[PDB]
Design a protein around this ligand. Structure first.
Ligand code: HEM
Ligand SMILES: *[C@@H]1O[C@H](CO)[C@@H](O)[C@H](O)[C@@H]1O[C@H]1O[C@H](CO)[C@@H](O)[C@H](O)[C@@H]1O
Ligand SMILES: *[C@@H]1O[C@H](CO)[C@@H](O)[C@H](O)[C@H]1NC(C)=O
Ligand SMILES: *[C@H]1O[C@H](CO)[C@@H](O)[C@H](O)[C@@H]1O
Ligand SMILES: *[C@H]1O[C@H](CO)[C@@H](O)[C@H](O)[C@@H]1O
Ligand SMILES: *[C@H]1O[C@H](CO)[C@@H](O)[C@H](O)[C@@H]1O
Ligand SMILES: [Ca+2]
Ligand SMILES: [Ca+2]
Ligand SMILES: [Mn+2]
Length: 331
């Protein structure tokens, strides 16, 4: 169907999304950039939807994190999330869709601004949240692999699916893990949806980018990069090691799987059959920029070979001296 402004879309309901598309590209994402706001909004899809336990409750991908923002933004594991919630609230006021829909929508638009990213399938028509999330449902960076895999499993994700979702950390930084160094990314390309994250998390640590005494932080391989202890454990754990390494220099797998599993996540606590497919509204992502590599100065013997089925792929290292990682511009 052709919308009131010439732009087209399979279903006519989806038309209402075009004004919101523009609003958030202009006013949320610094004109369509893969930066802080995009990263936080992606993070927000998870903190919303992960609020889903058959044991403890929660409506999952329901926009509760905004609807019930006084409760949820005050959970420990939600530290820092208040910023992007209070930035999105006004958009939700302004426009005529539920908070649940918006979070997923914004996150989908956001990812699509990242080189090498993908169009996460998006559905329209989530009812309002009817309850806040229980606490203790968001995985923390200092939790054990078992603890985390059980939590994700309680929510409906197999171990391999957790790896796929954690592709998100290829375009991500931390503000609260070490508050002395806000904006410190998880891989050396926070602005590119690539394999660098799965690569760089497998290296032997060298140093600590800020202070060393941080809960939930592992030793980093690179100056200007933070390593979550969780990612460090997951990248080496028997259940996940080989899946983690399978992602290395494997952009099609990162792309297809991330998209597919994100779609599952976005539809937690929701019935796909009572929603409306609006996936063609999401902009077309840019192609991958740069190619897989070990950081400059590094080699294959920096790699901790956790996977037993397969060797680490014979990557080459960037030319030159060990360089450091520039932060995410923001704050
Ligand atoms: C396996 C369990 C996970 C743990 C323990 C975890 C932990 C964390 C931590 C500690 C941060 C840094 C927050 C800060 O201090 O600013 C972070 C950031 C982030 N998380 Fe994860 N995470 C997990 C899974 C996921 C998943 C499944 C997604 C998918 C949407 C995701 C999306 C993000 C993004 C995009 C950021 C960066 C936000 C920014 O750059 O501002 N995370 N995560
Ligand atoms: C240091 O530079 C090396 C190449 O010069 C890379 O192998 C390292 O990953 C690291 O690069 C990081 O910083 C540079 C700027 O000097 C960026 O160009 C990279 O994208 C990365 O952020
Ligand atoms: C606002 O959006 C809701 C949900 O799509 C819709 O039912 C309602 O009619 C809209 N309000 C108007 C008339 O713009
Ligand atoms: C070794 O493990 C790799 C994953 O890194 C697989 O691609 C391969 O099939 C084998 O099991
Ligand atoms: C992204 O944009 C491309 C063209 O630039 C379309 O082919 C696609 O449908 C999506 O909207
Ligand atoms: C490495 O050092 C560069 C400058 O030399 C910083 O910009 C970056 O934050 C990292 O610490
Ligand atoms: Ca929720
Ligand atoms: Ca990256
Ligand atoms: Mn942040």
């Amino acid at each position: 169907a052709t919308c009131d402004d010439g732009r087209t879309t399979a279903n006519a309901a989806c038309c209402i999304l075009f004004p919101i598309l523009d609003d958030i590209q202009e006013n949320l994402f610094d004109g369509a950039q893969c930066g802080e706001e995009v990263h936080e909004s992606l993070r927000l899809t998870f903190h919303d939807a992960i609020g889903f336990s058959p044991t403890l409750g929660g409506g999952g991908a329901d926009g509760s994190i905004i609807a019930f923002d006084t409760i949820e933004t005050n959970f420990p594991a939600n530290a820092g999330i208040d910023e992007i919630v209070s930035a999105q609230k006004p958009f939700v006021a302004k426009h005529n869709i539920s908070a649940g829909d918006f979070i997923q929508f914004a996150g989908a638009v956001g990812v699509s601004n990242c080189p090498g990213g993908v169009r996460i399938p998006f559905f329209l028509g989530r009812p309002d949240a009817v309850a806040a999330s229980p606490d203790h449902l968001v995985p923390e960076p200092f939790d054990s692999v078992d603890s985390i895999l059980a939590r994700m499993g309680d929510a409906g994700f197999s171990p391999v699916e957790v790896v796929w979702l954690l592709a998100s950390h290829s375009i991500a930084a931390a503000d609260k893990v070490d508050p002395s160094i806000p904006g410190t990314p998880f891989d050396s390309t926070p602005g590119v949806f690539d394999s660098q994250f799965f690569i760089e998390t497998q290296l032997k640590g060298r140093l600590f980018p800020g202070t060393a005494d941080n809960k939930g932080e592992a030793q980093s391989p690179l100056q200007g990069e933070i390593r979550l202890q969780s990612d460090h454990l997951l990248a080496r754990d028997p259940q996940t090691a080989c899946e983690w390494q399978s992602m290395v220099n494997n952009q099609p797998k990162i792309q297809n799987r991330f998209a597919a599993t994100m779609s599952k996540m976005a539809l937690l606590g929701q019935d796909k059959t009572k929603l409306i497919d609006c996936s063609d509204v999401i902009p077309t992502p840019p192609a991958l920029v740069g190619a897989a590599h070990l950081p400059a100065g590094f080699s294959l013997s920096d790699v901790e070979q956790a996977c037993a089925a397969t060797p680490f792929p014979a990557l080459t290292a960037d030319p030159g001296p060990v360089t450091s990682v520039p932060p995410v511009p923001g704050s």
